[PDB]
Design a protein around this ligand. Sequence first.
Ligand code: HEM
Ligand SMILES: O=C(COc1ccc(OC(F)(F)F)cc1)N[C@@H](Cc1ccccc1)C(=O)O
Length: 454
Amino acid sequence: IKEMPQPKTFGELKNLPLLNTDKPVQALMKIADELGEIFKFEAPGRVTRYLSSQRLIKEACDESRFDKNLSQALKFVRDFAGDGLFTSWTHEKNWKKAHNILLPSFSQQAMKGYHAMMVDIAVQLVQKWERLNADEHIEVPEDMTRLTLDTIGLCGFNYRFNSFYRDQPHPFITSMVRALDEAMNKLQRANPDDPAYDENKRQFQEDIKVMNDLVDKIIADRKASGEQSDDLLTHMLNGKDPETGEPLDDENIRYQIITFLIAGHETTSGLLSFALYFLVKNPHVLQKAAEEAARVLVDPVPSYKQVKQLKYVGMVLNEALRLWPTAPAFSLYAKEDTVLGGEYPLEKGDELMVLIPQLHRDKTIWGDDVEEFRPERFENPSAIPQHAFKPFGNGQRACIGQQFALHEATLVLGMMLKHFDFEDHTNYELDIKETLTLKPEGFVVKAKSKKIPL
Ligand code: HEM
Ligand SMILES: O=C(COc1ccc(OC(F)(F)F)cc1)N[C@@H](Cc1ccccc1)C(=O)O
């Protein structure tokens, strides 16, 4: 039985002021590097424990001992994502009901139906880059966020955000990005009751009303039309939970749509941005991925079956998720009193945070080359220890979007590698911006067209 370390304190604010930064996840990663596999983190009225080792996280991933907790970030996002899948407790009726209804919508089989809509947006990205003049560059996270937002609009509810036609965001996205900024900024606030936050609170309520009004209108407009498009909204309007026999109500459907728009905007765009960063910084890896793209993608438009054959591209995406898991943490609570790692007693209700980027740097798992970009690490999943790699979370509360995200990212990265050579023309220094998620900021490249027609 060991006493766990704790980072520096600020009197009655305890560790809270360590989060007073634009990069709190990266600050927690530096704390983990200093203090090791487990540390205590206290704020007024709250204690959690940050886990960084596979040794402890493999125990935390035991669903008999630990269930998903809503971190403060997820409790603040719940003010607009409601009892959608991502911000519901496992024990709320709407979690299992929506999980049962939506699982068939997110299977590998469902991806065959979403593929044509994903190709529509991927072709828009390739045509944009084909049309750049010689003196121009690509704003990588900007263009990847245009793509992933448009994909989930089209597969989610047959709506075109038309992100490649504008710089000014859609009114829904203005409100969603500002609501996510308020939720994440509110985490650090020592004095949230201070009148100085009255305007923030007014604006947040306005942004919730904008998101609710626009998504409620999408649902009402679909029910009125009777249109049976092959999208998540049709699946939610028609689907019945096998257990309860009940469908989702229109309020829960709205929360699921808001949740899918958050995910599409924030996550897959980060993965694609980090993958392109690592490829331009590792030219031998880029060459190997480009060779696979050329060998497999033999038609003007990729098919579902061709994307399934981009195995090395899939290993590139896993190695990008290893070094920079764009959704960088998840939270657990102890279902009963238990001992972690034979050393750290926990009481029922005690909270843990899994720091995914640190888990992914555990040298006892990956070896001394842990900071190197080596997709070949993922050749054989049986050679990877249990719970070493958790970019989609754990167990029944793992990401429902995992198949969707990896299909879109594999398709797009394969088309990018087929159609262009890339230059790191600025010798870009990685700068990671934190929203709900991690993304490179200011990452720019030049593309040189291979002049292969679509
Ligand atoms: C690379 C892309 C993505 C990453 C890294 C990612 C990561 C994650 C992680 C780590 C969780 C678990 C969170 C927790 O335990 O608190 C999660 C849950 C979830 N993700 Fe994703 N995600 C991705 C893409 C998507 C997409 C595209 C969608 C939907 C369109 C989506 C929908 C969800 C939902 C609904 C949950 C909650 C599942 C449940 O508890 O029932 N994700 N995701
Ligand atoms: O450690 C984190 C990391 O923040 C994120 C949590 C989830 C998250 O969601 C996702 F990973 F899905 F993106 C993104 C960031 N958050 C903690 C920070 C905190 C605040 C107050 C007291 C103690 C601790 C939290 O939100 O509870």
